[PDB]
């Protein structure tokens, strides 16, 4: 019973990029495949991996900052949930 969500397009867009195959989720989907998103796409800095630079990326345009930590999740979750609806 967690909560269902729908992606907005671009971060549809980005889930879809990397093998995902539908329009809804839960939240700990959409968090696992921006996660493999980054790991694919080799977005992190290689000696302290919670590093992350977006600049270049559809990524950035989702959180609206060139870098971050993965540690900043109040950052994360609201930049997600202002990418998404809530279904069911
Ligand atoms: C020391 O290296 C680590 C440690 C933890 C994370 C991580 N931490 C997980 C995480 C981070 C933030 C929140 Cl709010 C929730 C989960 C999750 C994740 C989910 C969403 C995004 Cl945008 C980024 C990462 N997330 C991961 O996606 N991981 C888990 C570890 N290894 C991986 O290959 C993928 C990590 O993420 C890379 C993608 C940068 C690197």
Do not use: W
């Not at 990029?17 to 959409?30: C, F, I």
């Not at 992350?52 to 609201?78: A, M, Q, W």
Request: aromatic fraction near 12%; proline fraction near 3%.
């Amino acid at each position: 019973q967690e909560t269902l969500v729908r992606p907005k397009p671009l971060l549809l867009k980005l889930l879809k990029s990397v093998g995902a195959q539908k329009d809804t989720y839960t939240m700990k989907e959409v968090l696992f495949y921006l996660g493999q998103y980054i790991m694919t796409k080799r977005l992190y800095d290689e000696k302290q991996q919670h590093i992350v630079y977006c600049s270049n990326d559809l990524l950035g345009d989702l959180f609206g900052v060139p870098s971050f930590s993965v540690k900043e999740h109040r950052k994360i979750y609201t930049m997600i949930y202002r990418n998404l609806v809530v279904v069911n």
